[PDB]
Every structure is written in C-alpha cells, then in structure tokens.
C-alpha cells in the first residue's frame, strides 16, 4: 500500500476494550460481524422516521451526553497524547455516563471513537500516535443510551497551527452552521450540500463526497442520506420531529478519498489536510433544535 501522505498507523493496538454488561448494548454490539440487523432492515428505504415526545426526550438526553464526552476529549488535546490515550478516556466517560460508545464493534470497528488527523477524512482509529505540534484532529463521539444514539465531532487544533489550518478548519465551520441555519420544515434535504460547497468552494477547498450525513435515533445510521455537495440527489423534505446528523468533510486540496488497508481510515488522495464538524439536529416547527450543542459555551472548543 502506498501511503497518501506522511501518516502512517502507529500499531500494535490495545485488546477491545470491554463494557460492563449492566451498560445497555445496541444490536451489532454482539454480532460477530459487527452487522446491525435492524439497519440492515431498511437497506435502501428512504422513509424517514417521526419522533414520538418519548424519542425527543430520549434523542435529547443521550445527545447532552453525548457532548460531554467530546468535551472530555477535547480538554486531553495536546502535543503527546496518543489517540488510544483520548479513546480510552471516551470509553469510561460513556460507561461512567452508562451508554455504550457507539462506534465499539459497528462493523467491527475496534475502537470507542474515530481520532482523524490532518490527511485522514474520518473513521480514523485511535492508535499509538502522539499527536504533534501543530496538527489538526478530529475526534468524532457517538453514544448510545435507551435504545438511542447521540453523535457529534469537533476538529481541534494541537498547539500552534498554521494560517492554512486555521483557515481550513473556521471555513469547515462554518460550513456546517449555514447549513444548521437552513433547517426547517419544508427544506429538501438536498438543499444543505449546495450551501455547503458554496461557501467551501467560495474559500478554496473541496467537499468529500463519499461520506454524509445521516438519519439517526434508534438506529445509529439511517434515513435520509445526507450529501455535503451541490446538485446532489438526495431524498426527501424536511418535517418535524424528524433527527438526523450534517457532518461536512472539507479538503484542502481535492475531493478524492481512499481507504487504509485497515478498511477504515479514509484519506485524501492527494495527502493534503481535511477537516470536519457535526451536529445532531431535530427539526421543530420554527427551525432546528442542536441536541448537541454546548450549553455552558459560546462556540467551539477550536475558538475557545
Ligand atoms: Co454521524
Ligand atoms: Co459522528
Ligand atoms: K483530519
């Protein structure tokens, strides 16, 4: 394999870390295959759900949760901290908060959170790699208590960085809120992707095309399919009650991805730096409710 940049997996990882079994488990959890059976069930379904009063409550809770985790993650940014190390933090704050990490065995993931740093686009695996000195990481959460899943994902920066991840970071953002802020009853699902590349392309960045947004609840991915690119064909209206994540990934140079030999980390093609953010959002009648939204801060940890 021909490494698209200068990272490179920095391996033996930990054994899976276990979840006490009083912690509610999510179906794939025990799958030998890490297959989810109940999303599977609606392979290729573009119906989306209506959220009961119970599943609000539920979708509120576990995303509040959810966002204190990554802010757990975000206070252990800093040069020489391993990802394991940041992922093994993740790991207990979900058991402490009882939830099940999420990304634990979907698929056979083996780790509790993805940790992406600069080249990766997402789904990077936490491993033994200190972070350095003016990299970019992104640490993406996802929680999963009574039945229901909670995901957000902030990009930070590892010291002093330069003017281009400054750049590519506020731009990616921004991006994300302009599309939150286009949320209402009534707005095709494909609409955010062309808010979202205007303003990427407007800054000179690409937009990842291979990876969207995405319904969730009782399921950790599933209807609609959001895309994060102009002229997309996804499916849908907008309504409320109805959950589901933006999660723009934006490039500094092409929009070109590929994956590690590890069948997860995704990378830019051309090595170049990526970087993205993400929201839960519920739409209510006026506009959108951001589950995962700080409650006790102004912005994100990266302007904080
Ligand atoms: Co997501
Ligand atoms: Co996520
Ligand atoms: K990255």
Same mark, same amino acid.
């Given at each position: 394999?021909?490494?698209?940049?200068?990272?490179?997996?920095?391996?033996?990882?930990?054994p899976?870390?276990?979840?006490?079994?009083?912690?509610?488990?999510p +179906?794939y959890?025990?799958?030998? %295959?890490g297959?989810?059976?109940? &999303?599977?069930?609606?392979?290729?379904?573009?119906?989306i !759900?209506l959220?009961?009063?119970?599943?609000?409550?539920?979708?509120?809770?576990?995303?509040?949760?959810?966002?204190?985790?990554?802010?757990?993650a975000?206070?252990?940014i800093k040069?020489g901290?391993?990802?394991?190390?940041?992922?093994?933090?993740v790991?207990?704050?979900?058991?402490?908060?009882?939830?099940?990490?999420?990304?634990?065995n979907?698929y056979?993931?083996?780790?509790?959170?993805c940790?992406?740093?600069?080249?990766?686009?997402?789904?990077?695996?936490?491993?033994?790699?200190?972070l350095?000195?003016?990299?970019?990481?992104?640490?993406?959460?996802?929680?999963?208590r009574?039945?229901?899943?909670?995901?957000?994902?902030?990009?930070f920066?590892?010291?002093?960085? +330069?003017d281009?991840?400054?750049? %590519?970071?506020?731009?990616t953002? &921004?991006?994300?809120?302009?599309?939150?802020?286009?949320? !209402?009853?009534g707005?095709?699902?494909r609409?955010?992707?062309n808010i979202?590349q205007?303003?990427?392309?407007?800054?000179?960045?690409?937009?990842?095309?291979?990876?969207?947004?995405?319904?969730?609840?009782?399921?950790?991915?599933?209807?609609?399919?959001?895309?994060?690119?102009?002229?997309?064909?996804?499916?849908?209206?907008?309504?409320?009650?109805?959950?589901?994540?933006?999660?723009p990934?934006?490039?500094?140079?092409?929009?070109?991805?590929?994956?590690?030999?590890?069948?997860?980390?995704?990378?830019?093609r051309?090595?170049?730096?990526?970087?993205?953010?993400?929201?839960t959002?519920?739409?209510?009648?006026?506009?959108?409710?951001?589950?995962?939204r700080?409650?006790?801060?102004?912005?994100?940890?990266?302007?904080?």
């Open positions: 394999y021909r490494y698209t940049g200068k990272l490179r997996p920095h391996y033996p990882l930990m899976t870390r276990p979840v006490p079994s009083y912690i509610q488990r +179906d959890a025990d799958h030998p %295959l297959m989810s059976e109940s &999303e599977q069930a609606l392979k290729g379904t573009s119906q !759900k959220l009961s009063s119970e599943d609000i409550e539920g979708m509120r809770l576990v995303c509040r949760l959810a966002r204190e985790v990554l802010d757990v975000a206070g252990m040069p901290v391993t990802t394991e190390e940041i992922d093994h933090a790991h207990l704050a979900c058991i402490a908060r009882n939830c099940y990490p999420s990304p634990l979907y056979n993931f083996p780790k509790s959170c940790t992406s740093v600069n080249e990766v686009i997402c789904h990077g695996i936490p491993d033994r790699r200190p350095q000195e003016g990299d970019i990481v992104n640490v993406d959460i996802t929680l999963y009574n039945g229901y899943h909670g995901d957000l994902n902030e990009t920066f590892v010291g002093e960085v +330069d281009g991840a400054r750049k %590519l970071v506020q731009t953002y &921004e991006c994300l809120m302009q599309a939150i802020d286009a949320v !209402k009853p707005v095709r699902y609409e955010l992707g979202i205007k303003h990427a392309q407007a800054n000179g960045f690409s937009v990842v095309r291979s990876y969207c947004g995405h319904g969730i609840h009782k399921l950790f991915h599933t209807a609609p399919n959001v895309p994060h690119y102009a002229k997309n064909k996804a499916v849908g209206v907008m309504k409320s009650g109805h959950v589901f994540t933006i999660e990934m934006i490039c500094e140079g092409g929009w070109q991805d590929e994956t590690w030999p590890d069948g997860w980390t995704a990378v830019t051309d090595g170049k730096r990526s970087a993205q953010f993400e929201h959002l519920l739409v209510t009648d006026t506009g959108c409710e951001i589950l995962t700080r409650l006790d801060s102004a912005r994100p940890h990266f302007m904080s």
